[PDB]
């Protein structure tokens, strides 16, 4: 692709229309690049003694990069309802990214007084990690993605990423890399950069919550064939009559007695929270009293742990200690915002397959009983994996994460990523970007120095990002009416996603994925 | 005597799908087979009731 | 106005009673409901409606 200065290189394909068995989004967002690092790459590390747990060692790019990791990025509101409430599951298929209508502006602080103009000479580099050689560092919930409102004009982030580490120093088996060793293509205004891409084979979400539970699976009718020990003592307590072992037959009665073939998924205990702020214990402790894991003598909060729900029945105010997503609103401080100013997610449909968040997992026993001996009991609070476990998986979010790069590693169990989506080995490549640095006036005399003095400018143009989606359909005998999301037919004050007074786009809520019913 | 097979559970995550009571576990297992036998009305009113049928005849198959 | 079944009963109900109750004690007015029957047979819900009219004087010979 290749044309001039007054002919654009691209169009505005902002668009999306469905097949019944798969839908195509297009989405095109303006974007605008800064000098980032002053054209430096810069060693970044932690603060002398500032942290422990927080230690890191890394650096610090010229260059930008871009991220469409989130679903608002391609579904507007009224698709992601389209989507939601009419189908068993979905996935991705194909990805086709462009980049056009570029322009390099160069701009200059004269007196107290800034002029931009054009610098119609001037190139931009892109190129992109296509055999994963570079850090991966998208799948991490950072920002900078497109803006959810395609009216909505973006800063391009700037690219760092962090390597191995010992506290603030590094290891000998640290690596440093350089993006202009790579090769890259360099773009003036009028050209435009091409690129596709097809994911892998990845299972469909679960855009459906099961309509039994896994310990009411069986027939409420009739009784097993199977039997129990459920007297070991208690008798007809009279004469004579201390113990004695006695066995029932399973029945519809004895419903949580009855002989089992499954388990539920695997757990770890999270501290339960309550919203009302005074519940809760008078002591501070998000940290020496919630879930963690230690690497390498370093604590990192375990975040979203393995899927478990939320709350049971008859609560729905106590959430896990940080065991679920959590989105911002609207305009909200990134340092200690109100409970009134964020978004918790509700983890409920999975109740079925999943142990809760917040309580035990179940009862182990611990000795051996006699007349010498009582029985003892113990509540396990963690459970590894076993055969026979069943479970669900994290719900993703109009607003949330999509896909993330499984870790090339020796072994891995079930690569769904924890914070919920597709987890590819080879997921879509990150795409740098950067403008090439324009040397200002140098001396009439050669000098070997380092060259220092360069234009300040920035670029802006188009980008435009196309993904095809495979639907699995659904196919229910369910007679009454499913739930379903929907807007609040009252008379309200602003539309529900929407521009404001000001001209601010915001999501009110955030929207899950299990609002169809499939059986187990 | 014991259980043969056992459906597997359509989640999104199994571990060793083998029926703890032992035995097949299946994704896709031997079909659920229905049989009922079909509704025949008794002595019907030679006036017209919109009221739910209830009066049938007593038969097994 | 005489194109239904003169033996069936509607489906649909119809609002016949504003006051009228059991006319004794405390019983000033409520909302009554009746299913329209062969009997109700000018308050039945309706389809279609006369033609068009612009009264004339009325005449004898
Ligand atoms: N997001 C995602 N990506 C890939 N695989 C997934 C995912 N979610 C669940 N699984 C399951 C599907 C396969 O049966 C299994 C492969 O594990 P392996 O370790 O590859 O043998 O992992
Ligand atoms: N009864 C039964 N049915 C199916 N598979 C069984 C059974 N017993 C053991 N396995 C093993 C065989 C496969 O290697 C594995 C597939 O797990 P998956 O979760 O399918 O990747 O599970």
Redesign the interface.
Request: hydrophobic share 45%.
């Given at each position: 692709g290749a044309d001039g200065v007054g002919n654009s290189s691209g169009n505005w394909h902002c668009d999306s229309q469905w097949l019944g068995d798969r839908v195509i989004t297009t989405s095109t967002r303006t974007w605008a690049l800064p000098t980032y690092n002053n054209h430096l790459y810069k060693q970044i590390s932690s603060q002398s003694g500032a942290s422990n747990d927080n230690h890191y060692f890394g650096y610090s790019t010229p260059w930008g990069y871009f991220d469409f990791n989130r679903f608002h990025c391609h579904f507007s509101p009224r698709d992601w309802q389209r989507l939601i409430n009419n189908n068993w599951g979905f996935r991705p298929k194909k990805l086709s990214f462009k980049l056009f209508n570029i322009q390099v502006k160069e701009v200059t602080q004269n007196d107290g007084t800034t002029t931009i103009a054009n610098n119609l000479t001037s190139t931009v580099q892109v190129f992109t990690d296509s055999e994963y050689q570079l850090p991966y560092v998208l799948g991490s919930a950072h920002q900078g993605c497109l803006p959810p409102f395609p009216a909505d004009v973006f800063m391009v982030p700037q690219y760092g990423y962090l390597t191995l580490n010992n506290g603030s120093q590094a290891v000998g088996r640290s690596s440093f890399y350089c993006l202009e060793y790579f090769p890259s293509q360099m773009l003036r205004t009028g050209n435009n950069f091409q690129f596709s891409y097809t994911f892998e084979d990845v299972?469909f979400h679960?855009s459906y919550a099961?309509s039994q539970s896994?310990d009411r699976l069986m027939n409420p009718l009739i009784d097993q064939?199977?039997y129990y020990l459920n007297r070991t003592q208690g008798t007809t307590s009279g004469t004579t009559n201390q113990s004695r072992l006695l066995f029932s037959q399973a029945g519809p009665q004895s419903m949580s007695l009855q002989?089992?073939?499954?388990?539920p998924?695997p757990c770890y205990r999270q501290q339960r929270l309550s919203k009302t702020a005074n519940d809760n214990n008078n002591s501070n402790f998000p940290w020496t009293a919630a879930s963690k894991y230690h690497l390498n003598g370093r604590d990192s909060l375990v975040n979203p742990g393995p899927?478990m729900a939320s709350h049971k029945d008859d609560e729905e105010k106590f959430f896990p200690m940080h065991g679920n997503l959590i989105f911002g609103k609207e305009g909200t401080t990134a340092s200690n915002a109100e409970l009134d100013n964020v978004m918790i997610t509700d983890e409920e449909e999975i109740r079925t397959?999943n142990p809760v968040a917040t309580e035990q997992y179940g009862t182990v026993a611990n000795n051996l009983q006699s007349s010498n001996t009582a029985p003892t009991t113990r509540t396990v609070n963690d459970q590894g994996?076993?055969?026979?476990?069943?479970?669900?998986?994290r719900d993703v979010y109009l607003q949330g994460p999509i896909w993330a790069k499984i870790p090339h590693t020796d072994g891995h169990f079930?690569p769904?990523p924890l914070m919920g989506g597709f987890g590819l080995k080879h997921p879509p490549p990150q795409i740098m970007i950067k403008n090439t640095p324009v040397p200002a006036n140098p001396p009439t005399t050669f000098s070997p120095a380092k060259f220092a003095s360069f234009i300040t400018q920035y670029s802006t143009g188009q980008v435009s990002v196309e993904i095809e989606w495979e639907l699995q359909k659904e196919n229910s005998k369910r007679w009454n009416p499913e739930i379903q999301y929907t807007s609040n037919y009252n008379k309200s004050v602003n539309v529900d996603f929407t521009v404001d007074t000001n001209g601010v786009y915001s999501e009110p809520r955030p929207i899950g994925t299990r609002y169809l019913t499939?059986?187990?």
């Open positions: 299972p679960s099961h896994l064939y199977l002989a089992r073939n499954w388990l998924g899927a397959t994996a076993l055969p026979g476990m069943v479970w669900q998986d079930h769904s499939r059986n187990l």
